[PDB]
């Protein structure tokens, strides 16, 4: 096939001008979407706080409205997802991934509304879910929508505007452009066959989306952790040790969410009214935990600089980790609209933080700051639960700007993905798309 | 399909342990190699600098001793590549790209010592060439070696361990572990067909090779340029106008490296004595230019910070650029062992700095620092000419730590890879394998 190649090489990277213009408008929409989604989730969460003050006298009455307002927004978003778009439950990344295997449909007339509003309900109530799931799925369908509208043809534009959507989608969720482009390449694309995704397009997608986020969100960074210490070569061996820990725990986590789905499906059997009722139950609990033990609730992006700085007890770190694992399962296994990415950072940080603490109190010849062992393990549950380490590494790099930790960050990641693979572990997003296709 | 898919997923990212254990050693062996290559290169430049002091009075005698010292090592290089290994001329990355496609031979018994010692004469004589082509080539041939040595079977094993060698070989040439992986992913893998290259194994490769470079180089970096300022959103378009200028110049430079490739081959006609003699004249001229115009000779890492901080005048940038435009072609189109990756960065920096100084005088209301357009433009040739914008950016990002400029960097990078496609340019590294499969 020698001369087949010479002709392909000469014709490499010539994406059709219309597909470049089209990824430009997808990004621009996906951005505005995630900006609104984020402003939204915020306003709701804030009006929830404004109620506690109208009532701060009667402390039981306080614990009631803390429950119900989450319950109401929980149910509402459960309901919105069953009554109008069932593939918009849980995360929405498997669906957009199936949409690239052409095994699952992009019903954009239905999911755009159902994800966004159902999302604003579940997230806006203080549930343990990341606005990333929503913004990805939403972003993909926004790509499909501009496809089904401009009636562009070809597996190139379909697989591409499908991709740049999701990529610009993830970008605007974390102000992380490179992390979204790399998300498509390491994870989103179809992994068993070649594809025609114009990566240059995915760039034009992501750029415009990232710009739209900066247009409403500058001079405040999602996480500001400052410039932590370096790591000398004779400490690397401790980060690989932290990778090993996540490697055996990543898969133990995947199992629970799966089982916890079954266990939660046994509750409602499928019946919309048990499910929605179970939602406001979970929902209200998070709204309550949010008021009484706020480290155990919420999206998790909040206590990520708090845990780095060494402001938590070691007891606290154990508590948070157990309690948050517990709620993270309730909220995501339940199928409520919303992602798992942002809560998986928290669990990872809270763990690496508690590692550094022990890691300090054993090796003061090393002069450790426990903050480095958190930053390593932020993109760590992203390596042994979803086995996309090259993205978590670059994602964390984008959020924390502590490049000096590149080696232990990389090292800790390979530690988790190798041991996840070796104790019998399946990537989380894929292992969801399967149980779906088998039921289909 | 849907059945085929379900059990394909269940069984994903299960790279065979034997491949992994064999990927560690490849990185270990390329680091050392790469380090030792770098150490050699300098050590000879020192002698050139030392023999200048011993003859530091007869200014005419000095001109020729740096001619000869470098003319000699120039010649030793062209020869060891003609006599024992023709495919180890020039960069050698085309070759490994071909090798991954199964369209070129991997003669490691012939290339490793030819490149290693051929390079030291062209590098160590101070010829406009980077150590990257050399180290990536050596690193792949190293990776072919342990496939032979341990007699492993497969195209997976053969393609994986050939790549991680090439990735761990680019990392250790820049201290760029991410831009290692991302080069495999964005450029050198077979770009039109699926491939069983294990990302997770390319990773373990880049880790060892980097860990090697840090053992012999630490507390030092290749470029230090501080933390430059930030990029207001009302200034981002300037970084698009910058990529447009790079987008038109990108292919023009691709033509001239091909065009001049042929016009030096006319000189020797192919003859090993007409050729080596021409190259010692070039090499003798590079060691001679590197004594009167140090900025017009050598790889160019030297003048990257000295350019960023705005330390040159406008004229000196115009001069340094046009000079380097020339001395870059002469060294690489001649086919002397050594990449054009580093000497392009230098071109890109020099260019943007010039662009920034202009921007500063036109727009005092933007409070501009030209160093930001230098950082933007540094990986801009790499995006416009060899058309790997992603790898190019994460390269410059890993060497300059100015992540706040990630947006202006991403925008200029596109604005080249776009305006280069809209004016008829080509992946130079595939337009080589193109012309090298067209004669074959």
């Amino acid at each position: 096939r020698r001369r087949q190649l010479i002709r392909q090489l000469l014709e490499r990277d010539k994406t059709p001008l219309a597909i470049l213009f089209m990824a430009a408008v997808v990004g621009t929409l996906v951005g505005l979407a995630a900006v609104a989604f984020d402003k939204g989730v915020a306003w709701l969460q804030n009006q929830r706080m404004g109620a506690l003050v109208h009532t701060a006298d009667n402390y039981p009455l306080l614990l009631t409205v803390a429950f119900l307002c989450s319950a109401v927004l929980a149910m509402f978003g459960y309901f919105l997802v069953r009554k109008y778009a069932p593939e918009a439950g849980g995360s929405g990344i498997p669906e957009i991934e199936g949409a690239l295997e052409d095994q699952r449909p992009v019903r954009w007339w239905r999911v755009l509304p159902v994800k966004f509003f159902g999302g604003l309900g579940t997230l806006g109530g203080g549930m343990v879910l990341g606005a990333d799931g929503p913004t990805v799925q939403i972003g993909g369908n926004i790509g499909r929508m501009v496809l089904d509208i401009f009636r562009l043809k070809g597996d190139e534009a379909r697989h591409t505007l499908l991709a740049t959507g999701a990529a610009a989608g993830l970008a605007a969720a974390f102000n992380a452009p490179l992390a979204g482009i790399l998300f498509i390449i390491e994870e989103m694309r179809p992994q068993f066959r070649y594809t025609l995704i114009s990566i240059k397009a995915v760039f034009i997608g992501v750029i415009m989306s990232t710009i739209m986020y900066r247009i409403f969100n500058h001079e405040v960074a999602l996480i500001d952790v400052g410039k932590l210490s370096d790591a000398p070569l004779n400490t690397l061996w401790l980060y690989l040790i932290l990778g090993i820990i996540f490697g055996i725990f990543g898969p133990i986590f995947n199992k629970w969410v799966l089982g916890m789905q079954d266990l939660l499906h046994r509750v409602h059997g499928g019946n919309i009214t048990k499910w929605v009722l179970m939602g406001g139950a979970i929902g209200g609990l998070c709204g309550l935990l949010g008021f009484v033990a706020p480290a155990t609730s919420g999206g998790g992006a909040n206590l990520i600089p708090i845990a780095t700085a060494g402001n938590f007890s070691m007891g606290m770190l154990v508590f948070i980790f157990v309690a948050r694992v517990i709620t993270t399962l309730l909220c995501f296994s339940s199928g409520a609209p919303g992602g798992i990415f942002a809560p998986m950072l928290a669990l990872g940080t809270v763990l690496g933080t508690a590692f550094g603490m022990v890691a300090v109190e054993l090796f003061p010849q090393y002069h450790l700051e426990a903050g480095t062992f958190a930053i390593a393990g932020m993109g760590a549950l992203l390596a042994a639960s979803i086995r996309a380490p090259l993205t978590g590494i670059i994602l964390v790099l984008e959020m924390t700007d502590n490049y000096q930790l590149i080696l232990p960050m990389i090292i800790t990641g390979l530690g988790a993905t190798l041991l996840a693979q070796f104790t019998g572990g399946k990537p989380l997003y894929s292992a969801i798309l399967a149980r779906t296709l088998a039921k289909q | 399909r849907r059945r085929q898919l379900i059990r394909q997923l269940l069984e994903r990212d299960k790279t065979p342990l034997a491949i992994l254990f064999m990927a560690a050693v490849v990185g270990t062996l390329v680091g050392l190699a790469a380090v030792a290559f770098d150490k050699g290169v300098a050590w000879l430049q020192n002698q050139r600098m030392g023999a200048l002091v011993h003859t530091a009075d007869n200014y005419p005698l000095l001109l020729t001793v740096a001619f000869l010292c470098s003319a000699v090592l120039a010649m030793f290089g062209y020869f060891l590549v003609r006599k024992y290994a023709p495919e180890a001329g020039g960069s050698g990355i085309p070759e490994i790209e071909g090798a991954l496609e199964d369209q070129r031979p991997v003669r490691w018994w012939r290339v490793l010592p030819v490149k290693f010692f051929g390079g030291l004469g062209t590098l160590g004589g101070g010829m406009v060439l980077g150590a990257d082509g050399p180290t990536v080539q050596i690193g792949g041939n190293i990776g072919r070696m342990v496939l032979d040595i341990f007699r492993l079977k497969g195209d997976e094993a053969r393609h994986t361990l050939l790549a991680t060698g090439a990735a761990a070989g680019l990392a250790a040439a820049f201290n760029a572990p991410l831009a290692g992986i991302l080069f495999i992913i964005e450029e050198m893998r077979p770009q039109f067909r699926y491939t069983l290259i294990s990302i997770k194994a390319v990773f373990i490769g880049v880790i060892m090779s980097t860990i090697m470079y840090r053992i012999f180089n630490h507390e030092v970096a290749l470029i230090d340029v501080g933390k430059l300022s930030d990029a207001p959103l009302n200034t981002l378009w300037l970084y698009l106008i910058l990529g447009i200028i790079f987008g038109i110049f990108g292919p023009i430079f691709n033509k001239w490296v091909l065009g001049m490739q042929d016009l030096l081959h006319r000189v020797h006609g192919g003859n090993i004595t007409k050729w080596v003699l021409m190259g010692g004249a070039i090499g003798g001229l590079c060691g001679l230019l590197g004594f009167v115009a140090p900025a017009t000779s050598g790889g160019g890492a030297n003048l990257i910070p000295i350019a960023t901080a705005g330390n040159f005048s406008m004229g000196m940038l115009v001069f340094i650029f046009v000079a380097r435009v020339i001395t870059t072609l002469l060294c690489f189109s001649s086919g002397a062992p050594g990449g054009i990756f580093a000497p392009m960065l230098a071109l890109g920096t020099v260019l943007g700095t010039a662009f920034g100084m202009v921007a500063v005088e036109l727009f005092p209301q933007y409070h501009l620092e030209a160093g930001t357009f230098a950082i933007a433009g540094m990986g801009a040739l790499l995006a416009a000419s060899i058309r790997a914008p992603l790898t190019g950016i994460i390269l410059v990002l890993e060497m300059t730590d100015n992540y706040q400029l990630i947006l202006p960097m991403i925008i200029t990078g596109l604005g080249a890879t776009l305006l280069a496609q809209f004016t008829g340019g080509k992946p130079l590294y595939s337009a080589i394998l193109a012309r090298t499969l067209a004669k074959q």
Partner: antibody, heavy 121, light 107 residues
Framework: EVRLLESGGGLVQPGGSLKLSCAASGFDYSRYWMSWVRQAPGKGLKWIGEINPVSSTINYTPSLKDKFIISRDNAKDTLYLQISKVRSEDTALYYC??????????????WGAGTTVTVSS | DIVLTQSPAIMSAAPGDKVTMTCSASSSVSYIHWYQQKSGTSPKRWIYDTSKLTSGVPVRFSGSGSGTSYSLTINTMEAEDAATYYC?????????FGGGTKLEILR
């Protein structure tokens, strides 16, 4: 240059207390650990303690309680050392060093001139 | 903890001459640093991480060793090399210096 200039040492009476002061010039005093190391006349170098830039971790040699109180004032580029319950054993030459590493086994990067503490009645 | 005992507590030797001293350890130690002190001047870091020189240090200096024994060496000593040489470890915690080795000019 990079200069460490400590002051405050002299004559104190036993059971007393003093406050040595190390003042830095020629680099960023933060992002560096600082350390105190004293030397009895005609004797080896004994390490006293160390403090990290955010003052969150202060370590001292195996010796007593409020005996040594290392603190730093990042804002003045100055490092402090408080010796209480001053003995004749504490009559020594007190050095101020910045700490650094290589392969990760730490060393005393740049030292200062010294100050001399005499403890006699 | 880690007692360091530098062996030739005092010594002299001529210029242009090979000089060698020692650092032993009660336990095992990885990477030993060496400082040169002249009377009246701040100690100077001389040699770190078993073997590695510093900025300025004349190449006639050198370090060697392993495990529980390391050693400094001047190949063809000068005048300016007359001083005291302290080994210090920090493989273990807390760190410890040696007694010293006094190097005097011999005439």
């Amino acid at each position: 240059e990079v200069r460490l200039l400590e002051s405050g040492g002299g004559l104190v009476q036993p059971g007393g207390s003093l406050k040595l002061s190390c003042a830095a010039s020629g680099f960023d005093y933060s992002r560096y650990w600082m350390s105190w190391v004293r030397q009895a006349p005609g004797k080896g170098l004994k390490w006293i303690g160390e403090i990290n830039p955010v003052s969150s971790t202060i370590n001292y040699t195996p010796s007593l309680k409020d005996k040594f109180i290392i603190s730093r004032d990042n804002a003045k580029d100055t490092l402090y050392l408080q010796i209480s319950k001053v003995r004749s054993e504490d009559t020594a030459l007190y050095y101020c060093a910045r700490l650094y590493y290589g392969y990760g086994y730490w060393y005393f990067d740049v030292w200062g001139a010294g100050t001399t503490v005499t403890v006699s009645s | 903890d880690i007692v360091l005992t530098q062996s030739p507590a005092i010594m002299s030797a001529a210029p242009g001459d090979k000089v060698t001293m020692t650092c032993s350890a009660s336990s095992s130690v990885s990477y030993i640093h060496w400082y040169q002190q002249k009377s009246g001047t701040s100690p100077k870091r001389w040699i770190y991480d078993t073997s590695k020189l510093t900025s300025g240090v004349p190449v006639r200096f050198s370090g060697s060793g392993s495990g529980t024994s390391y050693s400094l060496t001047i190949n063809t000593m000068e005048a300016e090399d007359a001083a005291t040489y302290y080994c210090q470890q920090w493989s273990s915690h807390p760190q410890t210096f040696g007694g010293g080795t006094k190097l005097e000019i011999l005439r």
